[PDB]
Amino acid sequence: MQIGFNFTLTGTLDMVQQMIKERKIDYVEMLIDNFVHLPPEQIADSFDCPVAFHIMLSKYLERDREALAALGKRLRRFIDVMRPVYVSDHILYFTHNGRSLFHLGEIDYGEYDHVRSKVEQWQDMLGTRLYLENYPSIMDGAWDAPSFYERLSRETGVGVLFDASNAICAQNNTGAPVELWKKIIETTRHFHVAGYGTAFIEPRVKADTHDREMAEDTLDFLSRMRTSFDKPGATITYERDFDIDYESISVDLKRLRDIFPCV
Amino acid sequence: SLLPTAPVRIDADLYDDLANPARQSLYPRDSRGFIRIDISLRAYWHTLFDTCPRLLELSGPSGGAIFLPFMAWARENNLAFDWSFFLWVYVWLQQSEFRERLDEDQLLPVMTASATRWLMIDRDIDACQIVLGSRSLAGAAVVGAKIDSIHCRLEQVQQVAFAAPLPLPDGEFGYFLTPGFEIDHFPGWRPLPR
Ligand SMILES: [Fe+3]
Ligand SMILES: [Fe+3]
Numbered sequence: 001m002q003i004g005f006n007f008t009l010t011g012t013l014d015m016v017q018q019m020i021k022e023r024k025i026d027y028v029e030m031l032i033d034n035f036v037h038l039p040p041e042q043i044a045d046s047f048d049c050p051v052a053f054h055i056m057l058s059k060y061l062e063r064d065r066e067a068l069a070a071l072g073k074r075l076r077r078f079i080d081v082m083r084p085v086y087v088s089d090h091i092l093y094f095t096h097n098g099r100s101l102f103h104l105g106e107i108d109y110g111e112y113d114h115v116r117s118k119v120e121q122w123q124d125m126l127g128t129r130l131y132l133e134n135y136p137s138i139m140d141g142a143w144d145a146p147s148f149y150e151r152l153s154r155e156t157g158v159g160v161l162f163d164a165s166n167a168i169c170a171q172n173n174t175g176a177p178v179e180l181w182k183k184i185i186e187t188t189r190h191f192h193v194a195g196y197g198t199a200f201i202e203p204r205v206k207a208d209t210h211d212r213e214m215a216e217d218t219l220d221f222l223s224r225m226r227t228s229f230d231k232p233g234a235t236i237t238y239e240r241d242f243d244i245d246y247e248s249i250s251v252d253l254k255r256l257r258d259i260f261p262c263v
Numbered sequence: 264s265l266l267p268t269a270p271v272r273i274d275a276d277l278y279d280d281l282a283n284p285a286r287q288s289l290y291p292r293d294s295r296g297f298i299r300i301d302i303s304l305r306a307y308w309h310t311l312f313d314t315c316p317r318l319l320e321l322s323g324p325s326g327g328a329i330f331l332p333f334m335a336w337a338r339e340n341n342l343a344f345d346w347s348f349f350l351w352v353y354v355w356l357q358q359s360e361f362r363e364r365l366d367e368d369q370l371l372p373v374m375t376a377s378a379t380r381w382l383m384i385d386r387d388i389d390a391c392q393i394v395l396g397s398r399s400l401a402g403a404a405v406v407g408a409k410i411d412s413i414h415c416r417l418e419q420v421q422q423v424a425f426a427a428p429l430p431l432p433d434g435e436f437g438y439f440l441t442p443g444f445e446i447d448h449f450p451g452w453r454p455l456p457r
């Protein structure tokens with residue numbers, strides 16, 4: 001499997017380029033909506049490796065079609081210039097009755113017809129195959145999410161960007177076994193993984209913080225299912241957007257290649 | 264071992280109380296809905312006080328004397344918790360018991376925090392910079408500029424000085440957006456959004 005790292009902040013470029021030079025990562029996944037105003041060639045010339053796109057604040061489930069189309073048209077020529085390995089987005093609840101959520105909410109999976117319509121519209125604007133990431137659930141919506149993505153991916157042609165750390169959070173928070181995602185894991189070739197924290201007032205509830213090394217159950221999840229994960233063209237992106245130092249990322253990347261060695 | 268979801272089931276059941284600290288008491292402490300709100304409530308707390316640590320000089324380390332009355336004040340005035348979130352805290356401070364202790368050492372960090380927030384969340388292709396003005400900041404303004412180069416060694420938020428002076432806004436704050444990365448025209452201060 002190929003190992004990737006997420007490029008989110010402009011101040012981390014020098015370290016990500018060093019990771020590429022030392023063959024520590026095979027590609028760079030990007031928060032491409034953060035860099036929508038810089039030249040798309042300069043940013044392709046910044047990484048001597050393939051890149052991937054990760055869209056965070058499109059809000060395609062709720063954004064107005066006029067502003068959504070303008071973003072898609074801009075992202076379309078970023079796709080043309082850089083040819084990302086995949087383009088991925090989220091399924092997230094951003095706004096409730098006009099107020100912005102600072103901790104983004106898990107959408108109600110009973111609203112399939114609405115999500116399906118907005119997904120096909122957003123995937124059309126991007127002009128490529130879209131991958132959707134799963135939520136690190138806290139409430140009981142984790143139990144009906146695996147079949148929700150399998151249905152959405154079947155009817156709209158989207159792929160699933162499976163975050164192993166997020167499903168591990170869901171298993172710890174609601175009991176929903178990560179083995180519910182087995183069929184999705186054996187289909188999609190692109191994955192996410194990161195460390196997670198705990199709710200301040202409760203060490204039992206887990207939250208995706210992307211600020212630590214990988215947990216013990218997250219590593220055992222990837223290890224005992226290395227066959228279902230590993231595939232031709234398979235990729236996994238280590239995410240670390242907080243506490244970004246070279247050495248805590250170095251060990252986690254080495255533990256990642258230790259699970260998935262070449263043939 | 265799992266915490267009970269007691270009176271609810273999914274996140275969509277708690278949407279309305281995710282920013283209402285006064286409504287957290289009606290959930291069982293041992294319940295998962297109480298913790299979900301606490302996680303969301305701490306997200307508002309840390310977004311406000313990690314970005315503007317000097318506000319804790321007014322309220323104290325817990326920040327409760329600012330946080331709880333503002334969250335109630337924002338629900339009444341139907342605030343949207345957008346990029347103007349920090350600036351609305353400052354507006355509330357001007358009518359609060361801390362109004363006598365408001366100086367530029369408190370006004371500036373919340374102004375660059377709102378400019379920084381608009382920088383990270385706004386997705387208008389046709390909007391490159393935001394310009395923040397204040398009646399407590401004559402002759403200058405806070406400009407937030409989106410990234411247009413991966414190699415810029417500067418901050419994306421700067422305090423800039425205007426040769427010909429800008430009229431002070433009607434309310435305490437005012438803003439306008441520029442089509443590009445240059446300010447060659449003053450279009451008029453727009454009122455602060457919700
Ligand atoms: Fe993500
Ligand atoms: Fe992820």
Ligand SMILES: [Fe+3]
Nearest residue numbers: 165166194208
């Ligand atoms: Fe995560």
